[model samples]
Target: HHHHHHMVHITLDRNTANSWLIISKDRRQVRMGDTHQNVSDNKERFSNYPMVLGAQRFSSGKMYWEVDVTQKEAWDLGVCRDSVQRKGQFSLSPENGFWTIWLWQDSYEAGTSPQTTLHIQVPPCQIGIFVDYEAGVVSFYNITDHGSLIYTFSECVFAGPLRPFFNVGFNYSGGNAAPLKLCPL
Candidate 1:
């Protein structure tokens, strides 16, 4: 059995970053930038979605990665298909090409079609994501608390490569000043 506890390092893809997203030099961390740097308009850049994709892509096999969302009041992290819509405001659902979990105003939820609420006893500071492509399962775990299972999306169909996705969604009044950082292996 593949151990889901194993860590996998992945960096952010600047080319796919939104105009307001800031990518680190090593491309390992992504945060909301100041005043949307004058980046060229492109189809890859998200116009409404404040998110970015990972540089690495996965087609099959099991993979794991984690993000540090400490002090962040609002954020989203998970795996998204390479062809996921980057254009207008869209639902972050598996049917829409994303399997994600989000933090909003102290509430945690999964990006399922109808969205599922996670009643976690302790708010996770570090969130872990595991994807088993062959089995069509995407699982989220609370690494900050003894690897507690947060949620899972089963029977997913990976028609294409899936990349790590992240966003600091609507950080009202600088509430989510903390950057969405990927954990190093």
Candidate 2:
């Protein structure tokens, strides 16, 4: 799967993660914690949103990465502008620099204008993301289903560098306690 090259190893950018989202020491996994972490906040760190960005940013060319989202009831995954706001509440639309698809409870949806609803016959345990900067495209795939197409955001006009975006949510219940793990290619 080389458009030019395989995507580089992607690790979580701890500086961009919310205090409540626990990032693994290896930086390839992140999950929602029961309580807030003891840490300092910065402009890059998400204060209101429980999300994290990948450390590697792509300004040009195409890249792909896979996320192990198994057993999670809620999650968000895709590409986002590296400079998107992290301080307060904001919509996850492209206008806000986020192009993503989500799994909320039993429904799937795209983070597009008006938010496009999605339908998945077979549930996805692993998701693959492919982003092309020059093409202005971000595509999601169901890796668990032989890389079947899930959704795509086309004709995007990215302002700057872009990072892999990830978010996981659920209540104190055990249904959504699984962590979002970045998989090696």
Candidate 3:
């Protein structure tokens, strides 16, 4: 049998026609997504605005996953839509149609840009994110202590005291770029 140490990472690309990620209730499924579900509409809640869609889950013990969405294309909610969902704060979005991690969420309103701000509220979590761009490599750190980031991939995703819920979203607009790849291990 194979022993799983960490969750696997995935990336999206131009060839990706439709993508859908199913997070396991056991919290074993690390991260996955690409297409929008619900069958009724493509632009569901939080689909029009600049956004990124992704999901991660952890167990009772020390276990977690981290993602970094730092780029000129990656946008925060404060700048994207500026709504109650955003609550006037920094949000992240896929540079364009593609995001390092798409936090898929149905649209709050129709014919609107889905606010692209991945918000994982699970407690007792930490995130380590690294992004590559023209400037250089940028990293994001999100832990239980010492952090100003409203939502951190490494920190915000994990099992907490409240009920567990799966999340999904998209980045409506920004600097266009090819789909990014999650480092294959």
Candidate 4:
């Protein structure tokens, strides 16, 4: 049997958190915060993008991280170029510097150009992101089911440093109220 292991820890970057996203005090978890808060707008803050960036950035080697999505009904996680556009609504495809997998309406799908649908047996409570930057590949795994492969995006072109990315989809009315937390190894 072959065992693949990696050491990569990630946490949310409050500076890049969206106004409606509530980041935990420790910056480890992020949930949909009240929409009424008059958070100051800035270039770093996601205006139309309901997402946050990880504090760490990577340009080479294998990187791995897991997220706790058990409490969330809708969420997305992956890696993106540090300079990805966060000002307005944009495509979540690799062409746009995003390589992610999202869960919504009890289904999971890859955020590829064509948006691949993942026929997973059950909803993933925890999701793992594995990136081989030099190899130009990014993969998602279902951590709750013995690390089963959920999806993979190959031939990714990383023109710049890549950071962990996440979004607890907009549904402030409690539909997507759960926080998407970074899992510690």
Write the residue-wise lDDT of candidate 1 on 93-129 in tens digits: 8888999989877789999879889889988999989
Going through the candidates in the order shown, the clash numbers are 0, 0, 36, 0
Error of 2 at 94 (Å): 0.7
Q: Please give the CA lDDT of all the candidate structures.
A: 0.85, 0.87, 0.28, 0.83
List the candidate numbers ranked by lDDT, top first: 2, 1, 4, 3
Q: Which candidate achieves the best lDDT against the true structure? A: 2
Clashes of 4: 0
Q: Which ten residues in a row have the lowest lDDT in candidate 4?
A: 1-10
Alpha-carbon deviation at 125 in model 3, angstroms? 23
Task: Report residue 39 deviation for candidate 1 (angstroms).
Answer: 1.8
Model 3 TM-score, all chains together: 0.28
C-alpha lDDT (0 to 100) for residue 90 of candidate 1: 89
lDDT value for candidate 3?
0.28
In the range 77-108, model 2's lDDT, one tens digit per residue, is 99899889888778889999999999886899
Cα error, residue 142 of model 3, in Å, equals 12
Question: Candidate 3: deviation at residue 84, Å?
Answer: 11
- lDDT string for model 3 (1-185, tens) is 01124333432211111224333343323222434443332322233333322333222332223433323233221111112131123334322211122322221111113543444453213333432222222223343434324332222221122111112233345332222223224
| Alpha-carbon shift of residue 80 in model 1 (angstroms) | 1.0
